[PDB]
Scaffold this active site. Structure first.
Site, PDB file in Angstrom:
ATOM      1  N   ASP A 116      -4.627   4.728  -0.289  1.00 23.80           N
ATOM      2  CA  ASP A 116      -5.820   4.031   0.125  1.00 23.80           C
ATOM      3  C   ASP A 116      -6.991   4.880   0.081  1.00 23.80           C
ATOM      4  O   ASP A 116      -6.952   5.501  -0.898  1.00 23.80           O
ATOM      5  CB  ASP A 116      -5.470   3.576   1.885  1.00 23.80           C
ATOM      6  CG  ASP A 116      -6.398   2.306   2.117  1.00 23.80           C
ATOM      7  OD1 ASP A 116      -6.406   1.922   3.199  1.00 23.80           O
ATOM      8  OD2 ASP A 116      -7.021   1.645   1.095  1.00 23.80           O
ATOM      9  N   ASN A 143       0.795  -1.362   0.132  1.00 23.14           N
ATOM     10  CA  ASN A 143       0.095  -0.123  -0.046  1.00 23.14           C
ATOM     11  C   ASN A 143       0.823   1.380  -0.021  1.00 23.14           C
ATOM     12  O   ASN A 143       0.499   2.169   0.338  1.00 23.14           O
ATOM     13  CB  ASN A 143      -0.940   0.258   1.221  1.00 23.14           C
ATOM     14  CG  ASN A 143      -2.193  -1.059   1.129  1.00 23.14           C
ATOM     15  OD1 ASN A 143      -2.661  -1.490  -0.095  1.00 23.14           O
ATOM     16  ND2 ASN A 143      -2.606  -1.461   2.326  1.00 23.14           N
TER      17      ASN A 143
HETATM   18  C1  LIG Z   1      -0.130  -3.031  -5.152  1.00 18.17           C
HETATM   19  N1  LIG Z   1      -1.101  -2.211  -4.435  1.00 18.17           N
HETATM   20  C2  LIG Z   1      -2.025  -1.837  -5.695  1.00 18.17           C
HETATM   21  C3  LIG Z   1      -1.252  -0.734  -6.605  1.00 18.17           C
HETATM   22  C4  LIG Z   1      -2.164  -0.108  -7.718  1.00 18.17           C
HETATM   23  O1  LIG Z   1      -3.611  -0.367  -7.358  1.00 18.17           O
HETATM   24  C5  LIG Z   1      -4.261   0.075  -5.973  1.00 18.17           C
HETATM   25  C6  LIG Z   1      -5.201  -0.581  -5.952  1.00 18.17           C
HETATM   26  C7  LIG Z   1      -2.778  -0.415  -4.992  1.00 18.17           C
HETATM   27  O2  LIG Z   1      -1.931   0.572  -4.617  1.00 18.17           O
HETATM   28  C8  LIG Z   1      -2.117   1.120  -3.210  1.00 18.17           C
HETATM   29  N2  LIG Z   1      -4.072   1.495  -5.976  1.00 18.17           N
HETATM   30  C9  LIG Z   1      -5.020   2.210  -5.183  1.00 18.17           C
HETATM   31  C10 LIG Z   1      -6.232   1.455  -4.128  1.00 18.17           C
HETATM   32  C11 LIG Z   1      -7.009   2.399  -3.617  1.00 18.17           C
HETATM   33  C12 LIG Z   1      -6.617   3.728  -3.725  1.00 18.17           C
HETATM   34  C13 LIG Z   1      -5.705   4.341  -4.365  1.00 18.17           C
HETATM   35  C14 LIG Z   1      -4.688   3.598  -5.086  1.00 18.17           C
HETATM   36  C15 LIG Z   1      -3.835   3.645  -5.835  1.00 18.17           C
HETATM   37  C16 LIG Z   1      -3.237   4.940  -6.298  1.00 18.17           C
HETATM   38  C17 LIG Z   1      -2.056   4.933  -7.248  1.00 18.17           C
HETATM   39  C18 LIG Z   1      -1.717   3.277  -7.533  1.00 18.17           C
HETATM   40  C19 LIG Z   1      -0.722   2.947  -8.590  1.00 18.17           C
HETATM   41  C20 LIG Z   1      -0.755   1.557  -8.577  1.00 18.17           C
HETATM   42  N3  LIG Z   1      -1.827   1.056  -7.815  1.00 18.17           N
HETATM   43  C21 LIG Z   1      -2.402   2.286  -7.181  1.00 18.17           C
HETATM   44  C22 LIG Z   1      -3.392   2.469  -6.388  1.00 18.17           C
HETATM   45  C23 LIG Z   1       0.102   0.707  -9.318  1.00 18.17           C
HETATM   46  C24 LIG Z   1       0.861   1.680 -10.202  1.00 18.17           C
HETATM   47  C25 LIG Z   1       1.538   2.918  -9.869  1.00 18.17           C
HETATM   48  C26 LIG Z   1       0.528   3.795  -9.135  1.00 18.17           C
HETATM   49  C27 LIG Z   1      -1.595   6.043  -7.481  1.00 18.17           C
HETATM   50  O3  LIG Z   1      -0.675   6.379  -7.996  1.00 18.17           O
HETATM   51  N4  LIG Z   1      -2.364   7.039  -6.605  1.00 18.17           N
HETATM   52  C28 LIG Z   1      -3.299   6.510  -5.937  1.00 18.17           C
END
Ligand SMILES: CN[C@@H]1C[C@H]2O[C@@](C)([C@@H]1OC)n1c3ccccc3c3c4c(c5c6c(n2c5c31)CCCC6)C(=O)NC4
Lengths: 257, 329
Positions: free
Chosen positions: A151, A138
């Site tokens: 998050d 996270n």
């Molecule tokens: C491996 N963990 C996931 C990677 C991916 O997608 C998730 C689901 C998770 O990241 C916290 N993700 C979110 C989940 C809930 C709120 C915000 C985000 C979030 C966010 C981002 C993000 C990214 C990835 N993931 C992101 C995010 C992978 C590739 C680069 C950026 C992000 O760049 N801003 C919020």
């Protein structure tokens, strides 16, 4: 108002899987200046008041936060399908970042991330907000010298404090527990706690005074710091505010050659 | 309908929050009547035994209870009670009411219902008899709820101080035990007592906790039937206590606890009628036509409401014991 006109968002590639809907990468044509690079969080069951009510909350709590190491909320498109627009951490997930760069990242940088993380978490306790899932997975990487916590929505047994397993109580002090595992993951370059260990055994091991090994090359003061985070009795764990200052001298120590 | 508003439907499906605020918010977009309401809520939790559920609507400053007919509409039920006393004064409550010919061992193969019946019965017990119950019964049951609620901890986790401390300080023991149990004895003694009587229930899973919870509760709390002071006969009238339940159908008591006299089972019922008894006085008639028997089984209840409740009850059981969705009134 954080409301954004969909015209000003170009949806791009998909980058993650949450449990409401996919995360996308995109472009935001603000009149602020040029085309910002955003992450777009989406929702699958938009066709229902209940799911939406909660999905939007994520954005509505995130509003209250402003911090160098917590991903910013850029805005929200509140019309079906609902989108939460937030800043893109271009260098991606911490675990993958560390794994790739196992042999090119110094101790100082590792300690730096831990510290940045702790400024984030200290910030959040000052706002009474409990994360419930502090872990490398996270944590997103914004730059070489910059990680951010992501998050924020409502099982990771291997990360959780005993009291979270036993009695489902989640507090600041359980957070500190998970932060410790998190420092461990960082210092192990994104290697999971208890690989090859079944969830149900992990609970018993910890119950028996056992802890994660000291990661090789981690400096003793710090490992001492992690072990404090893993006091079984929640009241014995340090506050995030003390971790912060502890981690600071530890870093200045490593930096000071 | 005019408004249009909310309707908070309090239920007994566990939601890991606070059992007082366990409720479904059922907005304008569903359904149109009562058999509607139920089906929405039960299906969220994938219920099998749908025949057993009913909707109760009671004013929160009176003891009189209103069971709602399946087909009676959403708005016109609201527009006969609610519109007289500021709407934020009624409690809508989903409840198990119509029990099968062996409910425990049947609810067994239906997790969502067993927890529901457990929670419901647990709540009655905690609200009615927990304080003047034999105290070690109160001890055995609370420990059992701890054992159930926290399925993941080894049976000797409470042995550790910080664990007990979590239950005492954070969740509060009042969630498992009645006020009198906690105030009666010293806190350190209370600690020792809980850990110890826990030892006999340490090993049980969720089901086994629930079942033994009932086992320990049944010889001191009525929950396997409903009882009604009323009358019988269509000319000559006798005061009897009626037991209505799965194990003795419709029976009368005398009093007590002689082997209750079985009158009719639920398959033998054909029709149900109820009136304002006129005559006069606000009493309620109830009339049951029963297979084989020529003259119907008349029941004189103290009020209209009581008959409307007795009706719903036999109405509920007739539906269940047959296989019918159409009511028998
Ligand atoms: C491996 N963990 C996931 C990677 C991916 O997608 C998730 C689901 C998770 O990241 C916290 N993700 C979110 C989940 C809930 C709120 C915000 C985000 C979030 C966010 C981002 C993000 C990214 C990835 N993931 C992101 C995010 C992978 C590739 C680069 C950026 C992000 O760049 N801003 C919020």
């Amino acid at each position: 108002d954080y409301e954004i006109q969909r015209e000003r968002i170009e949806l791009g590639r998909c980058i993650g899987e949450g449990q409401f809907g996919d995360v996308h990468q995109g472009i935001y044509m603000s009149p602020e200046n040029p085309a910002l690079a955003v992450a777009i969080k989406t929702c699958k069951n938009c066709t229902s008041d209940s799911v939406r009510e909660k999905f939007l909350q994520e954005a509505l709590t995130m509003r209250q936060f402003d911090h160098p190491h917590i991903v910013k909320l850029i805005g929200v498109i509140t019309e079906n399908p609902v989108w939460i627009i937030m800043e893109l951490c271009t260098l991606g997930e911490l675990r993958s970042f560390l794994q790739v760069r196992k042999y090119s990242l110094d101790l100082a940088s590792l300690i730096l991330y831990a510290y940045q993380l702790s400024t984030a978490l200290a910030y959040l306790e000052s706002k009474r907000f409990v994360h419930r899932d502090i872990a490398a997975r996270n944590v997103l990487v914004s730059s070489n010298d910059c990680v951010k916590l992501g998050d924020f929505g409502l099982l990771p047994i291997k990360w959780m404090a005993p009291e979270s397993i036993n009695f489902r109580r989640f507090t600041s002090a359980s957070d500190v527990w998970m932060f410790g595992v998190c420092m461990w993951e960082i210092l192990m370059h994104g290697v999971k706690p208890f690989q090859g260990v079944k969830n149900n055994d992990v609970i018993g091991r910890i119950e028996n005074g056992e802890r994660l090994p000291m990661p090789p090359n981690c400096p003793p003061t710090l490992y001492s710091l992690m072990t404090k985070c893993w006091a079984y009795d929640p009241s014995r764990r340090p506050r995030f505010t003390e971790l912060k200052a502890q981690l600071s001298t530890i870093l200045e120590e490593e930096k000071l050659q | 309908g005019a408004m249009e508003r909310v309707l908070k439907v309090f239920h007994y499906f566990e939601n890991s929050s606070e059992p007082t605020t366990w409720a479904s918010i059922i907005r304008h977009g569903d359904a149109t009547d009562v058999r509607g309401i139920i089906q929405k809520i039960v299906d969220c939790h994938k219920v099998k035994n749908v025949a057993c559920y009913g909707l109760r609507l009671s004013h929160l400053q009176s003891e009189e209870v209103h069971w709602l007919h399946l087909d009676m509409g959403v708005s016109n039920v609201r527009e006969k009670f609610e519109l007289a006393h500021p709407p934020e004064e009624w409690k809508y409550e989903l409840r198990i009411r119509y029990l099968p010919k062996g409910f425990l061992n049947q609810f067994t193969e239906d997790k969502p219902t067993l927890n529901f019946f457990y929670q419901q019965v647990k709540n009655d017990y905690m609200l009615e008899i927990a304080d003047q119950v034999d105290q070690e019964i109160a001890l055995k049951l609370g420990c059992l709820e701890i054992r159930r609620s926290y399925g993941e901890m080894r049976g000797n986790a409470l042995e550790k101080k910080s664990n007990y401390e979590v239950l005492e300080k954070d969740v509060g023991l009042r969630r498992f035990f009645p006020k009198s149990l906690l105030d009666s004895v010293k806190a350190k003694t209370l600690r020792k007592l809980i850990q110890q009587t826990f030892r006999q229930f340490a090993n049980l899973n969720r089901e086994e906790s629930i079942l033994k919870f009932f086992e320990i509760l049944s010889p001191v709390y009525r929950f396997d039937k409903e009882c009604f002071k009323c009358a019988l006969g269509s000319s000559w009238i006798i005061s009897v206590e009626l037991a209505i339940g799965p194990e003795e159908g419709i029976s009368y008591l005398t009093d007590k606890g002689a082997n209750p006299t079985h009158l009719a089972d639920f398959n033998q019922v054909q029709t149900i009628q109820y009136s304002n008894s006129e005559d006069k006085d606000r009493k309620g008639m109830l009339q049951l036509k029963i297979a084989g028997a020529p003259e119907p089984l008349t029941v004189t209840a103290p009020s209209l409401t009581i008959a409307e409740n007795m009706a719903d009850l036999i109405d509920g059981y007739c539906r269940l014991v047959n296989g019918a969705t159409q009511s028998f009134i």
